[PDB]
Structure 1
Amino acid sequence: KRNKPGKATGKGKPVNNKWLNNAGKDLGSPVPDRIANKLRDKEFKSFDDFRKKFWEEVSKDPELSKQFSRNNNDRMKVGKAPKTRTQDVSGKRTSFELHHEKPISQNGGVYDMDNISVVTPKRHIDIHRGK
């Protein structure tokens, strides 16, 4: 499953200077095409490992890093998801999460970047409960 190794695949999508503004709506924000370009064909030990590398790459892309505060850029540099705004939090979940559009439990690609999006905790919980 998500705990097994694999190669990242996918093209991602172009994004503007408001990349995560819609992270709390619908299926959230797409993996940026530039980020996809850096992770494509690389192998990861787990989805958690892909997640860390994902955030590290975001911190290295000047066009994306500029969309986050200094404290949020430091978190991403070590592979942790940026903190969401207070209003998008859900209990102890206070950081952006990655969502698989098509669940692993049904041929859903664990490392397919075109099957992965960034969502706020609050939106993520809603997505899985049918909202």
Structure 2
Amino acid sequence: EPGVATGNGQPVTGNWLAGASQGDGVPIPSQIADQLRGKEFKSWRDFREQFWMAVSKDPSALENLSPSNRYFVSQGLAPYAVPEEHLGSKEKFEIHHVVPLESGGALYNIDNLVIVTPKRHSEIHKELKLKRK
């Protein structure tokens, strides 16, 4: 579903992915949002690839990735999370829609995105489901 990205992200210092395994996940750094906002995307896959390429071009965001993960984001691929944070065949950091798409959330609004591990993304959706009761 094609669209235009919007949103600004957050000012982030330090290790921007450390919190991806916990809580609400981590916001998108504003300097990554700046490389995407206003651009048109053909599909979610297109956005995801350009998102990780934007990460690859930012020294601050690259600094807390392993060397192998720096290679992968330079190819527009998501970096791998540690094994304890995998969920079935899902092994890489995921972009989660904070208000889910299925709950009226925006697809390419960067302020509706966080990064989460596969394990934490699944937990967040379980928790959202429970809280409907």
TM range (shorter): over 0.9
Stretches of structure 2 lacking an aligned partner (at least 5 in a row):
129-133
Task: Give the total of aligned pairs.
Answer: 128
List aligned pairs for 1:26-105, cutoff 5 A.
26-105=23-102
Rounded to whole Å, the distance in 2 between the matches of 1:70 and 1:109 is 33
Rounded to whole Å, the distance in 2 between the matches of 1:124 and 1:13 is 20
Give the CA RMSD over aligned residues.
Answer: 1.1
Q: Displacement of 1:82 after TM fit?
A: 0.4
Rounded to whole Å, the distance in 2 between the matches of 1:17 and 1:53 is 23
Q: Secondary structure at the match of 2:20?
A: coil
| TM-score, normalization by structure 2 | 0.92
Stretches of structure 1 lacking an aligned partner (at least 5 in a row):
none
Q: Displacement of 1:105 after TM fit?
A: 2.8
Q: Displacement of 1:48 after TM fit?
A: 1.3
- Following superposition, which runs of at least 4 residues in structure 1 exceed 6 angstroms of deviation? none
What percent identity do the matched residue pairs reach? Answer: 44
Higher mean C-alpha deviation, range 97-106 or range 50-59: 97-106
| Aligned match for 1:24, one of 21, 25, 30 | 21
Rounded to whole Å, the distance in 2 between the matches of 1:119 and 1:65 is 17
Please tell me the residue identity of whatever aligns with 2:32: I
Rounded to whole Å, the distance in 2 between the matches of 1:27 and 1:106 is 17
| TM-score, normalization by structure 1 | 0.93
1:5 matched to which residue of 2?
Answer: 2
Higher helix fraction (1 or 2) = 2
Please tell me the residue identity of whatever aligns with 1:84: A
